[PDB]
Amino acid sequence: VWKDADTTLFCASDAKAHETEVHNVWATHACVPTDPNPQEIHLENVTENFNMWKNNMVEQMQEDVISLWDQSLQPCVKLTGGSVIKQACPKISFDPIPIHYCTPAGYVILKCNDKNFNGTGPCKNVSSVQCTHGIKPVVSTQLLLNGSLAEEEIIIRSENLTNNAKTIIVHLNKSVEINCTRPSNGDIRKAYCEINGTKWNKVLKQVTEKLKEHFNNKTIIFQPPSGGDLEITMHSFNCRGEFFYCNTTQLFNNTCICNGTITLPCKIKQIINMWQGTGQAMYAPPIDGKINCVSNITGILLTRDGGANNTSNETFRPGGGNIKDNWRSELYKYKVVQIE
């Protein structure tokens, strides 16, 4: 017998003690090795309630990732609460690795295996595991990168769809590659991302039809963000230690829902609003040579316009900015229980 409970998790990973890559360094000193033959027990006739939007595992992953960035990616100047801090901002080796989250003795993780589980409510096919799957701590806005794919249909996740102030996580069932490059050869901060337009527009059409199921068949419209800070009006992510900010207007145009490569204009930014919430920071300028990251788009963060109740349209804009939602998109199926 068991009950919902919180406890300090530990982490496991396959980090390498000889790598200078910062995720490897961090996990070498903060995690243990992975279990080569992990155990999973499928519980028959067990129904468990889950709530991805109130899951202490998300807060613990946030603290790990804040910890890793604080030790790994130091800016030159840190503008934190009225004080200036100027330190060394050396260039680093940066490429996220999967991190497993694990329960100590007396606790277990219950895992929801319902194929179209939305992250809230009862789950019929539950298993018990000691550790989650490996989760890469990818910090980004607008688009979720390099995550897991939904196994059956596209899933819409929200703490409350009727509340337009709550973020929507769209969980894709098919990857769309995004290929971002600061060319070796000029403007050292100019970059771009290439996306296969046929794939993207097919997936976005499928996202439209899913949202229709949730909004009583109203007309589904995508628009670019209206206001907000740069981090949210742009698709922002970290590639090899450099901060990329990309204009996604071409992705969220309802015209094609147009085969061909979509080229998004991007810029590498040194001056950053810190997702940790600690103010602004300036990092070092870009390394020389070709800077490139090819990622899987596996999810989308959306905000829905208010004030459309008296029309047949619902308008959705790419959003995000609460990085905890990034960890929720991978942790939604897990909860910790204590074993009696």
Ligand SMILES: Cc1nc([C@H](CN)NC(=O)c2ccc(-c3ccc(Cl)c(F)c3)[nH]2)sc1CO
């Ligand atoms: C109350 C509060 N206000 C905050 C500010 C508002 N200005 N938000 C940020 O600073 C911010 C959000 C995301 C990012 C970011 C930066 C770089 C990259 Cl690559 C990236 F993917 C994401 N920054 S945070 C916070 C605490 O939750």
Ligand SMILES: *[C@@H]1O[C@H](CO)[C@@H](O)[C@H](O)[C@H]1NC(C)=O
């Ligand atoms: C739960 O498992 C049964 C048997 O494998 C399957 O028929 C059913 O579709 C599953 N439910 C979900 C939500 O995946």
Ligand SMILES: *[C@@H]1O[C@H](CO)[C@@H](O)[C@H](O)[C@H]1NC(C)=O
């Ligand atoms: C990207 O997606 C492909 C297929 O969707 C998958 O085989 C590959 O492992 C993914 N890479 C990631 C998630 O880093």
Ligand SMILES: *[C@@H]1O[C@H](CO)[C@@H](O)[C@H](O)[C@H]1NC(C)=O
């Ligand atoms: C993805 O889900 C949609 C329904 O949301 C479905 O029509 C489509 O077949 C799925 N695609 C794949 C590749 O499973």
Ligand SMILES: *[C@@H]1O[C@H](CO)[C@@H](O)[C@H](O)[C@H]1NC(C)=O
């Ligand atoms: C998720 O499923 C639960 C249970 O079926 C339901 O109460 C809730 O409205 C659903 N939420 C979303 C966002 O689909």
Ligand SMILES: *[C@@H]1O[C@H](CO)[C@@H](O)[C@H](O)[C@H]1NC(C)=O
């Ligand atoms: C969800 O949000 C709507 C609109 O803001 C509100 O009327 C409703 O009570 C909320 N539902 C819950 C369960 O809080």
Ligand SMILES: *[C@@H]1O[C@H](CO)[C@@H](O)[C@H](O)[C@H]1NC(C)=O
């Ligand atoms: C990404 O685009 C560059 C050109 O900008 C190309 O050289 C490279 O092969 C592409 N990578 C993939 C995986 O398509």
Ligand SMILES: *[C@@H]1O[C@H](CO)[C@@H](O)[C@H](O)[C@H]1NC(C)=O
């Ligand atoms: C882009 O996606 C389409 C969709 O299947 C595919 O056929 C094509 O090979 C991809 N690459 C292109 C168009 O360069």
Ligand SMILES: *[C@@H]1O[C@H](CO)[C@@H](O)[C@H](O)[C@H]1NC(C)=O
């Ligand atoms: C949308 O329309 C279809 C008719 O094609 C209907 O069967 C379905 O119930 C409608 N869904 C909603 C959410 O109104």
Ligand SMILES: *[C@@H]1O[C@H](CO)[C@@H](O)[C@H](O)[C@H]1NC(C)=O
């Ligand atoms: C993105 O590009 C479009 C078209 O080039 C432009 O109108 C828009 O202002 C850009 N967005 C931002 C946030 O700069």
Ligand SMILES: *[C@@H]1O[C@H](CO)[C@@H](O)[C@H](O)[C@H]1NC(C)=O
């Ligand atoms: C996604 O995974 C690929 C393959 O490991 C990696 O090269 C790329 O840099 C990752 N993207 C991000 C944004 O971390």
Ligand SMILES: *[C@@H]1O[C@H](CO)[C@@H](O)[C@H](O)[C@H]1NC(C)=O
């Ligand atoms: C919009 O609709 C929601 C849910 O139907 C409702 O709770 C809210 O009061 C409406 N807003 C306005 C401004 O009428």
